[PDB]
Nucleic acid binder design. Structure first.
Ligand SMILES: [Mg+2]
Ligand SMILES: [Mg+2]
Ligand SMILES: [Mg+2]
Ligand SMILES: [Mg+2]
Ligand SMILES: [Mg+2]
Ligand SMILES: [Mg+2]
Ligand SMILES: [Mg+2]
Ligand SMILES: [Mg+2]
Ligand SMILES: [Mg+2]
Ligand SMILES: [Mg+2]
Ligand SMILES: [Mg+2]
Ligand SMILES: [Mg+2]
Ligand SMILES: [Mg+2]
Ligand SMILES: [Mg+2]
Ligand SMILES: [Mg+2]
Ligand SMILES: [Mg+2]
Ligand SMILES: [Mg+2]
Ligand SMILES: [Mg+2]
Ligand SMILES: [Mg+2]
Ligand SMILES: [Mg+2]
Ligand SMILES: [Mg+2]
Ligand SMILES: [Mg+2]
Ligand SMILES: [Mg+2]
Ligand SMILES: [Mg+2]
Ligand SMILES: [Mg+2]
Ligand SMILES: [Mg+2]
Ligand SMILES: [Mg+2]
Ligand SMILES: [Mg+2]
Ligand SMILES: [Mg+2]
Ligand SMILES: [Mg+2]
Ligand SMILES: [Mg+2]
Ligand SMILES: [Mg+2]
Ligand SMILES: [Zn+2]
Lengths: 96, 74, 106, 55
RNA sequence: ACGGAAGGGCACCACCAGGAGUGGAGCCUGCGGCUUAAUUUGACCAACACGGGGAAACUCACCAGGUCCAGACACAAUAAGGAUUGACAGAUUGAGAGCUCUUUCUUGAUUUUGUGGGUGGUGGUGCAUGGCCGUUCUUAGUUGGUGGAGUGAUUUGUCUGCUUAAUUGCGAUAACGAACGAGACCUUAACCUACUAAAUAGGGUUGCUGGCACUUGCCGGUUGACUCUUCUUAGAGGGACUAUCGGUUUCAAGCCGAUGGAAGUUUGAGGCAAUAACAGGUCUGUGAUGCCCUUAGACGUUCUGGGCCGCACGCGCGCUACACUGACGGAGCCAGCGAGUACAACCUUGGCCGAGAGGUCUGGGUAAUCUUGUGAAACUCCGUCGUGCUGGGGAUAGAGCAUUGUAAUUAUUGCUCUUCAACGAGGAAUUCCUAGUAAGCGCAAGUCAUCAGCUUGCGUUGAUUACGUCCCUGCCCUUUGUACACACC
């Protein structure tokens, strides 16, 4: 993956924006949904995170369910150097 | 089952397009006006923005940010 | 002020029968509780879905064929009722599974 | 893999135009009602889906 | 287990009486064989219209080739005097591919090259495995708790008899009391002037009209009113349990007949379906998966083209015919299961066109509304043909016009015209079947862009012949014999 660096910031900031990604198996396709990049290097950057040990992967009907861990939140944070008081969206705790 | 045999090629070998690294490639873009001003060489592509230079091949210069759109003779 | 009549209609769908019958009876009983006129819970023909598959996953052996089916029922009900009463009725007591649809039919 | 060449062939229609949504197998697909599942993962998951043995 | 050993029973994947066929002919489809560069493969009652396998692309596995990395991670190596990417025009290329190159321009730490490692693989391995289903085996069989008999392999329990489709019971009993299988159960098709109701279903009265009669009449039309639920729907339900009676039964399980009913074959048909098993098969369904191989000129992936469709040949499901009960023209005009457009483009009404296929304009229908009452064939009536390979038969050949498809050539498919093959009811053999059944006839759905000769469901015309037996092929239980146990192969 010669993933362009600006699209790299884009994938990281979006994974910050919600914290959970889907990225259907379908290679070959022009545009990752709500991300505006080719799906293929999205898949490969995210699995690069998984191999580094900051994203857990789960497979279900060809849909790459991806979840972000605490040390992943860290790595993302100093990549964006956004202040440490703020968190991705998942940790917005809502009561029943 | 399936039984295979060693593949034999009809072309000797294809070599990768090794990138041509050039020593001090930027010396030929800009020149000094005898300890002073700076000057360009051979043309400047206007659409891309300042500082982008065209590619001479022969009797015509060629882009490479907007490579195919801009290829202007001279 | 929506006291005028709207000729509302309630469509139902359910892969089962018991909960569909309970829902229809409950709607009728609530309508009688508020004393509205109606056309009865007319039943719709059993829409049966049948698809057949080769029971073997590979394709050998004695030719075996299996049939998988559902049976859905609609049972639409039309009410000559005002606005907010029927809205409250249709937005309460919906047991899970039975899909309910409401149309003004204006 | 000049983008104009690689993967350029259209798959609007035909065998390979549809995947199983389960394994992606092109062979033996159930396109009725857009199940888009093959015969056999479908017989696996049908009792969970809502299909049942009646007759 | 086996016996061309005995006894008791069963099975139209056995027979009997028969019915319809195949094997004869042509064509399709699938294997084998051949050929080919590939004509990819797995199968050999339980392989061969099976892998939903109706492959022109994809499909895909094969063949010629052309591309790319989809090698994550960590280390090391180089590295902003550039690790490295891309690129017009040209040669090269099938390609308007910076595939490669000519020149140079562009991009920057993501890559590149070594390392361990990893990912993917319709690659090998179903004689390493799961799961799945096929088969033994659609038969009536199968264990375990004590208890007795044997030292034990084991046996009894599970059985002399009669009955049933059934290890189903009556019963007798070193056997007793329980479990799986069968049945029970579930769905469906039968009957409901009983209930609940119903413009997305039907009627009836009556409006308002059309006709033809003249008299109150009939056939109609009408999303006007009133009214009802037998007819169509779906809910609670009812109804059959062999009910009653007559025969026969150590008089008991039960069997036969008649009647009443709708139904008297378990009411019909299925759906589930036991222990043990198979070296049955599927790594070719999967991101089910062990091991092995590969993992960059790749067995990964993708693009173009060819192939899986070829041909001296055998075999199986098949379709249409060999004509008169027919062929062809006219005239009638009866169905049911389905299915149907959305984030995409289906069902198609109706109207204009074209002889046709087909085209066009518009409308409904996300569905008891619309397609559709799918006005379906076979069939019914009237005509032409009149025994002659004949108007039977429509394969094989040309010429055109259409639609699908990016792509119809190795004819996709439909229509027009012409050519008219073999075929005289088909050898030894062999297949399926007992009542809405065989067969004939279509219809719908699945495969689908386009296609069926296929399969799955449905309805229609709807029979001949039993209503039984081990003669053939097997199956079950018991007895007996064996030098068999990888078990008469
Ligand atoms: Mg018989
Ligand atoms: Mg036989
Ligand atoms: Mg006979
Ligand atoms: Mg025949
Ligand atoms: Mg023949
Ligand atoms: Mg058998
Ligand atoms: Mg085809
Ligand atoms: Mg091809
Ligand atoms: Mg190809
Ligand atoms: Mg090749
Ligand atoms: Mg694969
Ligand atoms: Mg393997
Ligand atoms: Mg004992
Ligand atoms: Mg015993
Ligand atoms: Mg049963
Ligand atoms: Mg009635
Ligand atoms: Mg009596
Ligand atoms: Mg039965
Ligand atoms: Mg069994
Ligand atoms: Mg084997
Ligand atoms: Mg095996
Ligand atoms: Mg491959
Ligand atoms: Mg073939
Ligand atoms: Mg022959
Ligand atoms: Mg067959
Ligand atoms: Mg003729
Ligand atoms: Mg009809
Ligand atoms: Mg002739
Ligand atoms: Mg016929
Ligand atoms: Mg088929
Ligand atoms: Mg021995
Ligand atoms: Mg011998
Ligand atoms: Zn430029």
């Amino acid at each position: 993956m010669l993933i362009p660096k600006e699209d790299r910031k884009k994938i990281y900031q979006h994974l910050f924006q919600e914290g959970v990604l889907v990225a259907k198996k379908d290679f070959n396709q022009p545009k990752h949904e709500e991300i505006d990049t080719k799906n293929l290097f999205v898949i490969k950057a995210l699995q690069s995170l998984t191999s580094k040990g900051f994203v857990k992967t789960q497979f279900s009907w060809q849909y790459y369910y991806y979840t972000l861990t605490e040390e992943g939140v860290v790595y993302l944070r100093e990549y964006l150097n956004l202040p440490e008081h703020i968190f991705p969206a998942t940790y917005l705790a809502g009561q029943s | 089952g399936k039984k295979r045999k060693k593949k034999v090629y009809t072309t000797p070998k294809k070599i990768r397009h090794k990138h041509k690294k050039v020593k001090l490639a930027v010396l030929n873009y800009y020149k000094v006006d005898d300890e002073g001003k700076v000057a360009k060489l051979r043309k400047e592509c206007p659409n891309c923005g300042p500082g982008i230079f065209l590619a001479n091949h022969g009797d015509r210069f060629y882009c490479g940010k907007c490579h195919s759109t801009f290829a202007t003779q001279k | 002020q929506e006291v005028v009549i709207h000729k509302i209609r309630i469509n139902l769908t359910s892969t089962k029968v018991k909960q569909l019958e309970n829902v229809s009876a409950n709607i009728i009983k609530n309508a009688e509780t508020f004393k509205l006129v109606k056309k009865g819970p007319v039943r719709l023909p059993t829409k049966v879905l049948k698809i057949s598959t080769r029971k073997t996953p590979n394709g050998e052996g004695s030719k075996t064929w299996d049939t998988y089916e559902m049976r859905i029922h609609k049972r639409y009900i039309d009410l000559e009722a005002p606005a907010h009463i029927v809205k409250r009725i249709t937005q309460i007591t919906i047991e899970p599974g039975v899909d309910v649809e409401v149309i003004i039919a204006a | 893999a000049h983008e104009n060449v690689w993967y350029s062939h259209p798959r609007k229609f035909g065998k390979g135009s549809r995947q199983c949504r389960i394994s992606g197998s092109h062979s033996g697909l159930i396109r009725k009602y857009g199940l888009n599942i093959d015969r056999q993962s479908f017989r696996e998951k049908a009792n969970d889906i809502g299909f049942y043995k009646y007759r």
